[PDB]
Amino acid sequence: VPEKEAIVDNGAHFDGEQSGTVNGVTPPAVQHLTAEVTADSGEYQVLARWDTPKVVKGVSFLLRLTVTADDGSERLVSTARTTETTYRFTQLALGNYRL
Amino acid sequence: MQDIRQETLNECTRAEQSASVVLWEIDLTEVGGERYFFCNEQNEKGEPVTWQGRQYQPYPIQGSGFELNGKGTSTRPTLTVSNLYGMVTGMAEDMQSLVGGTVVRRKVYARFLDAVNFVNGNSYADPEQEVISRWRIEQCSELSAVSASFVLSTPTETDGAVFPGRIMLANTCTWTYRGDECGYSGPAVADEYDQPTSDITKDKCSKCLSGCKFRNNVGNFGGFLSINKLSQ
């Protein structure tokens, strides 16, 4: 049956999104990230709040707190990994902090 | 015990009995063919054997390997038939080698045959005296210029089957188009390549999500359109 070959290399109509549905189950950016400097407890504390985006099979969060240098560069103050949607920072020196 | 009439049981115990005639029927109606009736012998008048008013044309045919065993492999009988004059050949090129057809075998004592078969008639003629067995054609094992051998199998034969059979897939529908589970009854929309068509004879589903959307049948889509990302 030499005429079989023509049928074989006629693959069906795959739907689309060949690149992988442009997600790669990569989590979206966290939303509503608000920092709050308060002293109602008698000392300076920073409360950080955020909302979980739509993820797959579960989620965790990575926090990176850095402080601005005098020359415009940055210094790594702290790093953390959590599962909660809130965090608390205490005993922070004066400066401009980016979380 | 088999449900066979008292006359056959009476004949089985006799010391001197009549010849046991085996009549065969090939039923290809379910596979798009016709029904053929065969007997290994003619009658005393040189005519095809008439059983229950139906003529069974003479043709060299012989079956072997018939047994009833529950333990072990399912029994696979064999049926050898004459291929002189290229008759079975003509069936092999028209019915896809007869595969999927039915073979019906009747055992009848010659004393119960129809009266037309005998010159002097049959006073004990009884059309209700027969033993029937049904099988299916599995493979035309050999076909030559002389003969043809067929492998038979019980209709159940759980050989290639699996259980459970329905498979969980994404981007593909496992239902049968316009079937019960698919539940589609609309007009012609597109072919298997999603190209729109108003031709009913060219209306098929691509089994993809786009093919289902073409018919607005996404509710009845047989796939699971989220599992592709949880399996990583």
Add this chain to the structure above:
Amino acid sequence: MGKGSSKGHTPREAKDNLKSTQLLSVIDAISEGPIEGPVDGLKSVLLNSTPVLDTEGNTNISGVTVVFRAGEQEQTPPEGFESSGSETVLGTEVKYDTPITRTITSANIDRLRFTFGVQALVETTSKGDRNPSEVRLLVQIQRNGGWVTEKDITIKGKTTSQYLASVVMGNLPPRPFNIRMRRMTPDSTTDQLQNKTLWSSYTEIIDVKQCYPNTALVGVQVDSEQFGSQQVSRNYHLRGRILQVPS
């Protein structure tokens, strides 16, 4: 509580101080064809190894929304599960005198989610200290000619920065739509009481359109905070197939 569908819904415990709530939405597939269903009810749903309802009816776990589906050929999709969302940001303040309105008038929407909130909620007094503020807002639909209230929301809290919430609703009439959200509290006339409101954005939800024709799905929608960082292992004490048994 029925055959072919169920609702469960043990209520959620009231929160104390604002805060968000992580939600775990699962859909579990079991069996084929019409099945009888749960052995008892909501006591047959085990979230890790514990039934939702104690043997006396007490709720072991609060915040569960099991929605059982049998294997009937003619089913309906499990409600409350989203598939895609379209978020449009319209962050503006909502004053007492002026409502907002946006006239979404889409075509393929299923549910509407409102992202409202307050920029601050402190009630400062002379010499210092702070107190809650009691903000109230109202979300209304066009409903032809009469703006019928859909969801009135009251917020109590201290806060210092922006806080955002969300509210979902359905039953949407056809779509020459007009939505609205307006303020109830009078205004922040003084400087020591800041209770400004805000309508950040709204989202259009399309939900799950695939009513899986012959499987038996469950769906949970349990809050994931009560359980630890470990994953939730759902178990079900179901009954089996509806057989073709001799009459």
Add this chain to the structure above:
Amino acid sequence: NGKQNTYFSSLDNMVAQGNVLPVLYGEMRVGSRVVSQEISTADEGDGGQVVVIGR
């Protein structure tokens, strides 16, 4: 370790791709084939009219 499994039960939430759909025949406590599992933010307010966020 030493656990014995059978061919007629499962208390696990197995992967549901290319894995067929199970069949349950009467009673039994069962696992599942997870079809969807997403973690999001719960929206306050369930039904009715009145919604209170903070108490």
